Copies of this chain bind each other. A is one copy, B any other.
Amino acid sequence: MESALDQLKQFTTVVADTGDFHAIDEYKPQDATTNPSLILAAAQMPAYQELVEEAIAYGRKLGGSQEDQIKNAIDKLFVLFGAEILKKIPGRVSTEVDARLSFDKDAMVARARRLIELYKEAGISKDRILIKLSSTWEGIQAGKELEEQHGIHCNMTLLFSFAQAVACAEAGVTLISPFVGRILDWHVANTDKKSYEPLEDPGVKSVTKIYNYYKKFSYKTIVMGASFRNTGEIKALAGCDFLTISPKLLGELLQDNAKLVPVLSAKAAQASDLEKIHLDEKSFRWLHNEDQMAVEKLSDGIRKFAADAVKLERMLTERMFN
């Protein structure tokens, strides 16, 4: 159209990164994403206290130990936000399984089926859902199993290293969400270069590289850049399959109207010099370890989400067991 946002929609499928579904439709996204940190934030908003009470009652109604109830309440809460979001958009929503299961393959699978079940009980088809999993080797294997054995589509997140990107591709997962701004954060905090040209942004380069690898070798996994610090990073990735953006940045993209030029494409990726590689667990863990930023961000990413999960549990138990 004319705004940067509408222009971006010509080259990339825009996705809204938030749990605050009231602010969604203003940007008309295709899909939506949520994570432990977003649900937490939104769950504390006055406007959504109604969903929380319903989730609590669900816990209460299913009964069992208090743990069965906080788990089921939280699981339902996620599903509730999910369903509401779905009424506002035409595509899929991403619901993440607890980060504390990041290294437990079977737990992530079982928990994923559980979420898909809860959604099913609410009349929502799994085709509208993307289960978010931490991109650890086990999370990726959980993704593989979910896709191949249960037809459950996944959103591999907290993806930082090229190794992770590769393992996900071979695992044939539906979608990956490479974090861009957090890569910038690491380079800003550790290296001595605190600034980057949109195109030089480390995060943008990781996603650009991953995108070229995926397209050049015909992997059907969807590349969705995520977590952004500015709109320059977003514009430098125009052309990417998908880009999940925060309401704040979506709003900025809706405000300005400079000419937006596509940057990523199947033709440029085909001209890049990347060579195909195969990774078993050993090679994966090694190649991943060689990427310090990735090792440290994936690790801290898991702790932060887990913490958001712990904080959400606490407030809820305090709320339903005084």
- A residues near B (Cβ < 8 Å) are 100, 102-105, 107, 136, 138, 281-282, 285-286, 289-290, 292, 295-296, 299-300, 302-303
Contacts and interface: CB of A to CB of B under 8 A. Distances in A.
Contacts of A103: 281-282, 285-286, 289
A295 to B, nearest CB: 5
Number of chain copies forming the complex:
2
Nearest to A296: B296
A55 to B, nearest CB: 26
B286 A303 contact: no
A296 B292 CA distance: 8
By Cβ-Cβ distance, the 7 closest A-B pairs, closest first, are A103-B285, A104-B282, A295-B299, A103-B286, A103-B282, A289-B299, A296-B296
21 contacts: A102-B286, A102-B289, A103-B281, A103-B282, A103-B286, A104-B282, A104-B286, A105-B282, A107-B282, A136-B285, A138-B282, A138-B285, A289-B299, A289-B302, A290-B303, A292-B299, A292-B300, A295-B295, A295-B299, A296-B296, A296-B299
A145 B103 CA distance: 23
A293 to B, nearest CB: 11
Nearest to A290: B303
Nearest to A104: B282
| Most chain B C-beta atoms within 10 Å of own C-beta, residue among A105, A138, A285 | A285
Contacts of A303: 289-290, 292
| Most chain B C-beta atoms within 10 Å of own C-beta, residue among A289, A290, A300 | A289
